[PDB]
Here is the input.
Amino acid sequence: GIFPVACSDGYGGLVTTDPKTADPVYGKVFNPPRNMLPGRFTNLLDVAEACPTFL
Amino acid sequence: GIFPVACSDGYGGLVTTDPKTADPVYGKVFNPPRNMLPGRFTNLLDVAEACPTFLHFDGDVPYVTTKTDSDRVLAQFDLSLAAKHMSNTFLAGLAQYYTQYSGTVNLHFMFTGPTDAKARYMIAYAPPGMEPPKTPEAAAHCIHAEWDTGLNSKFTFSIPYLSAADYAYTASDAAETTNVQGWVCLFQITHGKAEGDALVVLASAGKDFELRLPVDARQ
Amino acid sequence: GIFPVACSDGYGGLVTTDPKTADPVYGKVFNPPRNMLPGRFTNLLDVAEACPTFLHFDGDVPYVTTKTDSDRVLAQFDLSLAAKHMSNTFLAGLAQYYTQYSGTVNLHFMFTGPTDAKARYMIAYAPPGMEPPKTPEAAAHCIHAEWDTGLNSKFTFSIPYLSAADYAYTASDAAETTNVQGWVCLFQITHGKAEGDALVVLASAGKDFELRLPVDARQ
Amino acid sequence: TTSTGESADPVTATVENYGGETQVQRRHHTDVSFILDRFVKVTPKDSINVLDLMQTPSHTLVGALLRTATYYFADLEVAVKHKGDLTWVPNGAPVAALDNTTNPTAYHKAPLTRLALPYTAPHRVLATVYNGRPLPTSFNYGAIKATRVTELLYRMKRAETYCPRPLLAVHPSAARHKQKIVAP
Amino acid sequence: TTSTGESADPVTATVENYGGETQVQRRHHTDVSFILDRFVKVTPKDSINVLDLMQTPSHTLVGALLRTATYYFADLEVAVKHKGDLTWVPNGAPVAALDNTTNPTAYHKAPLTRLALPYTAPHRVLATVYNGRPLPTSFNYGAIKATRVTELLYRMKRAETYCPRPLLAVHPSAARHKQKIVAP
Amino acid sequence: SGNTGSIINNYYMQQYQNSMDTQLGNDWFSKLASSAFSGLFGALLA
Amino acid sequence: SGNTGSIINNYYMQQYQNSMDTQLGNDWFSKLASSAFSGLFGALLA
Amino acid sequence: RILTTRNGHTTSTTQSSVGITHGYATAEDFVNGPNTSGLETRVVQAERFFKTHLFDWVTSDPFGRYYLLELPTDHKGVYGSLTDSYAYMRNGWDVEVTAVGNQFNGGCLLVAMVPELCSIEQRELFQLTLFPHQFINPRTNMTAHIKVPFVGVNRYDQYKVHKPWTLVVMVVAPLTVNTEGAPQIKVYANIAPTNVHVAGEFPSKE
Here is the structure.
């Protein structure tokens, strides 16, 4: 035969924040090299610690 | 029990370009051996580098004839792959199926005139932001090359890829009044007895020419 | 949570020839031991190589009789597996279920006449593109063999597979006026006292005969 | 290449006689197990259908190639489109059994239902032709019943054939058999 | 950089002549196998549709790039939206075969049906242009039949191309070809 | 052996998916076709 | 080789998913484009 | 720049020559295929030049003037007889084209071996350089020389119903005499088959 499976209820509905990836349509593109551009911040708190603002 | 699973929403819909394979219906066939047939090309750019093709000019001829008058501008056109001049080339043939490109585009010049006629030419690249030059003396400040006729009949000139963004659109947007990639200009410095003699021009990809993001634009 | 998954569109529809197995309902049965029964064949071509079968001729007889007249053409027919002559063979029996074939098709000849009669025959292959030969002298330029009667009653001749494309269609297309694979021609060179004596002919696959792409054509 | 035809020993002459060279063969597509593994249509009956490989039409690719062997063995895969609940029964079981859900029963799930069935007959190997027109009742894989069955398919698995038999083609009226071949 | 133009030997001058520096190239998007692998629409016919790559429009990205090579090879993936049961037939098989469920047949399962098909032609490699307007009937992947087919798509796999041919762009009337480009 | 395209092991035991064979105690036709005589019966000339 | 995104092995044998190639006995254009002459034909000055 | 080409017992010599252009491959693919059962043979005596006229290239011809020549053509030598005695053939082409004015003529020609040439579009000529070619520029060379293998969807072809190669000669620049040149230039071709192989003898007419 073939590998049996059980489609479960209450699973699979789309979730806006869900942690999984879309199926790629269109492949093999290369980006223009962006390495070491100035002024990068990976976390929105670090810019909050290093740049005080007015009251 | 049996292994449970969750059928997820928004997945599984068919995608024309999707990266997965159909379920085989009908098996165990063998092909007639095709190994080492002649003239194979695995990439559509390699055939663009190794086989230059003609341009297009007024009168619908792939050459420009020497002229005697105060006007030394031999031919002048936008640098784009949507230009009318490039339209007949193979190189501008692939472009219409891709959105963006980068790299060098080579131009080939071959002087057709008789052995008793001599001429000297100038090709130049006019970057965007200013009107292109109308005189060789004005163009002499740009990037340019200069060659004349002789034993060798052919000259090859590499048009640099010079732009702010690492890639440039192939198509020409309707809201673009002036070319973004600038112009290239071909001048005739002078000619010995060359009146009515033809210069055929060719175009092909360079070493670093790169083309990406396929799209079906109709056309 | 639980392992997420994406149900994909365009997959899972049933395919009559698909390569996968049903879910077993009812288990733990044992077969009566069948090991080493006689007369097994695992491939339908092997039975085609080891068991030649008769052809079909006018009067619906699987043989052709010697003739005395200016006409030495004994039998002549298309090389195809859709021919009327081949129609009764086992070899042309399998063909109708496959689209394409390649390789050699063997013909077997057995002279049935009495011990006091002697004849000499010619088989020849006429490739496509020209009308097939009407006289042995015309055919002598083709590929041919020649044999006569004697102690051994049987002769075997391999008809080559010779074509542009590595495979050839079994069926005969209605828009085909002239056979694509050419003809084979059987001649009678001469006969001692052989009037009214029969030559039975047989056909079977060769060593390299290969048959592929199954199809259900009705029939 | 001359020999004694009455011997019946197989004699295969080759092109090397007049100076040719024999080429390479790939016979996968004529393999018995390969060629017979696929679905073939059978005209069903409204409710009870006995699973029998001889119901396949004789001119179909699976039907014809089957009938060329006196003695055949294989498993079975069925593909059925039906209403209600498809109930299967093993060989030699009473007809009154098809009404019991205890026997294997596939509840209706669209579009159709595919099963895999073992070789259930008592005989070591079945037969296409039997000398005794009718074939003995013991040749069958069992039967299936449903409220109604719209389509039925057979797919043989692990096919094995024995003692080949004639295989006939269509007899042309003209010198060739001319059909319209797919063309652009 | 001067040379003899009549040689036809490729000559690529570089920016280093007047003092530039050549940059790095990434050509993945122009790779033949990469660029030709995707679906392209073909206007179907109600019932029988012969699978042929030349039916693709010449101006489409897959159609145009196909026609630039005289000799091409590839497998095929189809995506079909149809009513009834989609039946496929290998190359060179009679048209009367499309009516047999024994041949590969995909029962209707919404929204559509995707198959993967092998290269079935006898010729070692197919051709976009043939010298003999018509192309020989032997160039095709076979045909498909259904009660009706609403849409049809072709996707080439493992594409291989040989002997390139002209590829033309649209010829502007003005000095440039000006189109409206996507903008916010 | 037949037409099967799975490169991964079948989900169900071999004992279920198929019927189990037993033993007791192309076989014939390929061994027949392999014995075909390809030679020339008489002396060869040229 | 083409556009394929699966990092896991295809579920069906290579023999089914694709047609099997055979042998007998960018190839040309890349070997052509790699021979392009980038040099200067005459003597260089400055 | 002297070049001597010998095929069979025939030769050609050119004092003004730009060299040879090898189309699509340097050497023939596999000759012996599965489809002929090894019954193919090589014909040595068939490889040699033969000459034919193309056209007369005059000032009035504008850009785009083109001349198709399909190969093989009608041939009265040994190579012609083969086509009637054998149902399957293959071969490569070694092509040479010669247009002689003097060095004071002007204009240019483009010769190319185009496989499977059917109704090329006018605009498509601007890209015609994609195929193997050489320019004839009377300023420099009087001779164009091209070598190409056998191409086709079959390993052997039937030259009755199929012509794989087509020689095409196009005017990229119109002729100019400038009073010191030849008034018009005649174009000839010198062509030889290569690597001919045949199979499948026909019967005769008798």
Summary: The longest helix of chain D spans residues 61-67. Helices of chain D lie at 32-35, 61-67.
